[PDB]
Amino acid sequence: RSVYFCGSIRGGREDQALYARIVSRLRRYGKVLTEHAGGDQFIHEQNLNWLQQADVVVAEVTQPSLGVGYELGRAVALGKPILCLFRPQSGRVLSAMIRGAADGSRFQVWDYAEGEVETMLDRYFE
Amino acid sequence: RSVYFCGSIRGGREDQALYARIVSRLRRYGKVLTGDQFIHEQNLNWLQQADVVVAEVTQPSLGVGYELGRAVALGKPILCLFRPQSGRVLSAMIRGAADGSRFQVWDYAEGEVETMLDRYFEAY
Numbered sequence: 001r002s003v004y005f006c007g008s009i010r011g012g013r014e015d016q017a018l019y020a021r022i023v024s025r026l027r028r029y030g031k032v033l034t035e036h037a038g039g040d041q042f043i044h045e046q047n048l049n050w051l052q053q054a055d056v057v058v059a060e061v062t063q064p065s066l067g068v069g070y071e072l073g074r075a076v077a078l079g080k081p082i083l084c085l086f087r088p089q090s091g092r093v094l095s096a097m098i099r100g101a102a103d104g105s106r107f108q109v110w111d112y113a114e115g116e117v118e119t120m121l122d123r124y125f126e
Numbered sequence: 127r128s129v130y131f132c133g134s135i136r137g138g139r140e141d142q143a144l145y146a147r148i149v150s151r152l153r154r155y156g157k158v159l160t161g162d163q164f165i166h167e168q169n170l171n172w173l174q175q176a177d178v179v180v181a182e183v184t185q186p187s188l189g190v191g192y193e194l195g196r197a198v199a200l201g202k203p204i205l206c207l208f209r210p211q212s213g214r215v216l217s218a219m220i221r222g223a224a225d226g227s228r229f230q231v232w233d234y235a236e237g238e239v240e241t242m243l244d245r246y247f248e249a250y
């Protein structure tokens with residue numbers, strides 16, 4: 001199983017430490033394809049190739065980010081299963097387009113609190 | 127001719143006044159098409175019908191990115207507008223999608239958004 005991870009970078013790196021813990025936990029459920037200056041053309045093409053190869057896409061969507069949204073858009077259009085993880089304690093209301101994309105199966109959006117991310121991942125993969 | 131406009135809402139409404147100026151100007155060039163489950167389905171229907179997709183990408187937003195992702199996969203022509211004087215660096219995925227043709231990303235200053243739209247649509 002191959003896993004593609006999405007998380008804000010230029011959108012803001014507030015959750016960078018959490019992302020590292022998510023990527024470490026994903027390694028027990030599959031090969032993490034992502035490597036979250038060749039330039040942005042190179043980054044885009046490399047990532048699209050990885051997204052095509054992915055069996056599942058996991059995104060932490062608490063921090064707003066164009067690139068995370070874009071990856072999820074390309075992923076849906078490729079027919080990839082998607083898990084989005086969101087923390088309501090951020091005080092933000094999650095994107096209408098991401099929340100509304102949820103269908104409870106091919107596209108899941110799960111609210112979670114600090115301390116629960118590993119448990120959420122276990123639940124999804126097991 | 128139909129146009130779909132994308133701009134941050136829950137990502138932040140900092141540029142909402144600018145979005146209204148964009149939408150006003152787009153009406154010269156075509157019909158501007160533009161709870162959550164309903165919003166998503168309605169918007170995907172509009173996106174599928176749109177001849178061109180226009181996005182102001184200065185404020186980071188998951189929904190705007192999502193719209194652009196779905197639009198690329200649908201084969202729509204896309205214009206993204208970005209303000210470098212905002213002081214942030216535009217998303218690697220949006221900047222990297224640029225090809226100078228069916229996915230264009232234009233840097234502009236806040237006062238010249240109308241001129242940027244004029245240039246694109248007079249060409250298109």
Ligand SMILES: Nc1ncnc2c1ncn2[C@@H]1O[C@H](COP(O)(O)=S)[C@@H](O)[C@H]1O
Pocket residue numbers: 005006007008009010011012034035036043047065066067068071216217218219
């Ligand atoms: N340097 C990079 N190397 C690999 N991916 C990058 C890189 N920069 C950005 N990304 C991709 O873009 C997404 C973040 O979008 P952004 O708009 O915040 S730059 C990430 O999920 C990641 O997938």
Ligand SMILES: Nc1ncnc2c1ncn2[C@@H]1O[C@H](COP(O)(O)=S)[C@@H](O)[C@H]1O
Pocket residue numbers: 094095096097131132133134135136137138160165169187188189190193
């Ligand atoms: N209330 C709404 N009605 C129609 N579209 C909405 C609505 N709220 C958000 N959107 C769509 O989501 C995009 C913004 O994404 P966001 O993640 O900031 S909520 C907009 O370009 C818009 O297209």
